[PDB]
């Protein structure tokens, strides 16, 4: 039974849990100055606990697909929402902030669940117009969460404590948890099957093989790494570097997210006169402009932030007109099966992601604003790099 009329519950609930995922990032990078508060921990805990949660996205990212297929679809989804929830939980008792870590780490590995099983399940479960209108809406959380979940959380600690904020990540995955109990359809093919690791290892050692895949991976990671290592320091270098207000740190993630959210609405007005390779040269130009604007601007004078800000925010207009075509292309630069291309370039963002937020950190704490930028331009570079090879 392909969709129908009462099986949107399922879709639903997993756009739900998605969504406590994304959040349980970023309603919690501002909440953590009250952490590293509580635990009398240094500011360079802060982005870790970002990086910690990238990090575990990435731990079974290349087993849940091959594996979900044998054992099913809906135990293994499962699986994932509950330790979501037990984790959530349990990071209410890490006593320091080196436990705290590990449960973000943990809790994390929460992630790939989503895109491995859940996502997969969707495709086989539905007709491409409904599964079409669905990943919309799933990209569209994926939109919102950033730019909603900064400015909730830092609203929260200024109310209630960090805790609060991993009850409701539970909470709301634990919603989540009953309604796919009751609406998610088994759609696993090759149940019972025997999974060989040799083999899978050997899968992935092939779409490595494929350089033009790589550079397009390698890319996707590079060109988001500046917006991602913002989410991650934003609260140290907004209101422990400038010493500015909440409500301050609040108001510059509006031009930025906003900027995403534009280019994203721009490249939906294009789509149908452009193509891909235009559309990531035409992001081109506001994603190497914004860089070099914050990076320029922060070398000149190390607390100019309105300058950063305006930078990132034409950076990221840049990225929501490009990032979706360069997704599109990598996937189909290999003929490999989707599910381990998919896992692939996933696994290779976040080694990035979770690297470069950690250098992002040294670069900042050493070397203030005009490091933090100059760093976010040199992945700038690596992606227009990419981008010349890949388009040629
Ligand atoms: C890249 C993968 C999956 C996409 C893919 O496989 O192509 C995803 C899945 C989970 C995603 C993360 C969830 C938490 C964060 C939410 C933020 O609002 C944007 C940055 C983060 C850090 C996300 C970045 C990236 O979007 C991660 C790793
Ligand atoms: C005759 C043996 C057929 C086995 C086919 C199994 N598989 C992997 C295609 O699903
Ligand atoms: C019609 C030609 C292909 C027939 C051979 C199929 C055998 C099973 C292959 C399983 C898929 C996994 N792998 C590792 C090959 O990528």
Redesign the pocket.
């Known amino acids: 039974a392909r969709l129908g009329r009462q099986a949107l519950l399922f879709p639903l609930c997993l756009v739900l849990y998605e969504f406590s995922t994304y959040i349980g990032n970023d309603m919690i990078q501002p909440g953590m100055l009250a952490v590293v508060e509580q635990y009398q921990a240094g500011i360079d805990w802060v982005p870790t606990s970002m990086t910690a949660y990238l990090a575990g996205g990435m731990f079974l990212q290349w087993l849940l697909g091959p594996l979900s297929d044998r054992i099913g679809r809906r135990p293994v989804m499962l699986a994932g929402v509950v330790w979501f929830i037990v984790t959530c939980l349990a990071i209410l008792l890490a006593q320091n902030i080196e436990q705290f870590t590990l449960l973000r780490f943990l809790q994390g590995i929460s992630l790939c669940f989503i895109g491995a099983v859940g996502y997969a399940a969707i495709r086989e479960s539905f007709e491409e117009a409904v599964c079409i209108k669905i990943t919309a809406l799933m990209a569209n959380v994926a939109l919102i969460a950033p730019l909603l979940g900064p400015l909730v959380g830092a609203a929260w600690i200024h109310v209630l404590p960090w805790e609060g904020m991993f009850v409701l990540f539970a909470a709301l995955a634990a919603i989540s948890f009953f309604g796919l109990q009751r609406a998610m359809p088994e759609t696993a093919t090759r149940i019972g099957e025997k999974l060989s690791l040799k ?1 899978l290892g ?2 992935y050692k092939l779409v490595l093989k494929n350089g033009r895949f790589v550079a397009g991976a390698l890319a996707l990671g590079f060109v988001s790494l500046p917006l991602l290592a913002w989410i991650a320091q934003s609260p140290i270098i907004i209101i422990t570097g400038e010493q500015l207000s909440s409500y301050e740190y609040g108001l510059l993630q509006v031009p930025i997210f906003g900027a995403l959210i534009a280019g994203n609405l721009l490249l939906a007005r294009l789509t149908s006169r452009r193509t891909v390779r235009s559309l990531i040269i035409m992001g081109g130009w506001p994603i190497m402009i914004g860089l070099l604007v914050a990076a320029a601007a922060t070398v000149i004078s190390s607390h100019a932030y309105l300058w950063m800000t305006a930078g990132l925010s034409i950076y990221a207009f840049g990225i929501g007109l490009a990032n979706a075509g360069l997704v599109r292309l990598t996937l189909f630069a290999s003929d490999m ?1 989707k599910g381990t291309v998919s896992a692939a370039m996933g696994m290779l963002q976040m080694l990035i992601f979770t690297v470069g937020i950690e250098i992002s950190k040294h670069a900042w704490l050493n070397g203030g604003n005009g490091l933090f930028n100059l760093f976010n331009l040199v992945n700038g570079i690596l992606w227009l790099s990419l981008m010349v090879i890949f388009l040629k």
């Open positions: 083999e050997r899968d099966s």
